[PDB]
């Protein structure tokens, strides 16, 4: 049931992307072939103590959310966590981590920016055949900062523990959520699946 839990928030979450499918390929649904916990104590009391710190600042609420985060670099991030030393401030919300509610925005980050070139083996975006991993994450966002248009920063504004990029006519299609310190997000599920063909 957890796992099905799991499943069903990968595939609901999906969206038309206004790209076409040109990041990360053409699809209304996937095949979800396996789906892991991830149990890594230190990173886990890391996160935990940061997750109480961030409560006691924010009126006893952590604003905790179940978020996916979409990287060539999975495999590093369950063994040593997410790192705001490899974020840098090019991004829309400038030197932060990345994470969205919907599992087809951050399909689009699995091999790079934009995509980059798709899969190692067939060098396409939009590639049915090899396997993807997402990972669905706890993510404290603590007092959140509420921006529409791009904001460059280093770090979470004075007195916030992120910020929630809302969409915006000119802006953005779909949320999305930013940490600026890697402690204040858990790799909870790692998701190996397909992108189906419609
Ligand atoms: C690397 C990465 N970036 C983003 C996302 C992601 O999953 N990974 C989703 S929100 C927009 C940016
Ligand atoms: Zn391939």
């Given at each position: 049931k957890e796992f099905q839990?799991?499943?069903?928030?990968?595939?609901?979450?999906?969206?038309?992307?206004?790209?076409?499918?040109?990041?990360?390929?053409?699809?209304?649904?996937?095949?979800?072939?396996?789906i892991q916990k991830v149990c890594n104590k230190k990173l886990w009391e890391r996160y935990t103590h940061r997750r109480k710190e961030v409560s006691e600042e924010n009126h006893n609420h952590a604003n905790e959310r179940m978020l996916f985060?979409?990287?060539?670099?999975?495999?590093?991030?369950?063994?040593?966590?997410?790192?705001?030393?490899?974020?840098?401030?090019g991004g829309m919300f400038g030197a932060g981590i990345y994470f969205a509610e919907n599992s087809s925005k951050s399909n689009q980050y699995?091999?790079?920016?934009?995509?980059?070139?798709?899969?190692?083996?067939?060098?396409?975006?939009?590639?049915?055949i090899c396997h993807?991993?997402?990972?669905?994450c706890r993510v404290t966002l603590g007092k959140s900062f509420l921006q529409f248009?791009?904001?460059?920063?280093?770090?979470?504004?004075?007195?916030?523990?992120?910020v929630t990029g809302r969409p915006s006519v000119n802006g953005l299609a779909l949320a999305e959520y930013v940490?600026?310190?890697?402690?204040?997000?858990?790799?909870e599920y790692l998701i190996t699946y397909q992108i189906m063909r419609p």
């Amino acid at each position: 049931k957890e796992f099905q839990s799991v499943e069903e928030e990968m595939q609901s979450t999906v969206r038309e992307h206004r790209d076409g499918g040109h990041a990360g390929g053409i699809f209304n649904r996937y095949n979800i072939l396996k789906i892991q916990k991830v149990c890594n104590k230190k990173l886990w009391e890391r996160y935990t103590h940061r997750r109480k710190e961030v409560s006691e600042e924010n009126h006893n609420h952590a604003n905790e959310r179940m978020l996916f985060h979409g990287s060539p670099f999975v495999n590093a991030i369950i063994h040593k966590g997410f790192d705001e030393r490899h974020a840098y401030i090019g991004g829309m919300f400038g030197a932060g981590i990345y994470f969205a509610e919907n599992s087809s925005k951050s399909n689009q980050y699995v091999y790079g920016i934009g995509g980059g070139t798709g899969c190692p083996v067939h060098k396409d975006r939009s590639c049915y055949i090899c396997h993807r991993q997402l990972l669905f994450c706890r993510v404290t966002l603590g007092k959140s900062f509420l921006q529409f248009s791009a904001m460059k920063m280093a770090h979470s504004p004075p007195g916030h523990h992120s910020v929630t990029g809302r969409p915006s006519v000119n802006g953005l299609a779909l949320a999305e959520y930013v940490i600026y310190r890697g402690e204040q997000a858990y790799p909870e599920y790692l998701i190996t699946y397909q992108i189906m063909r419609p």
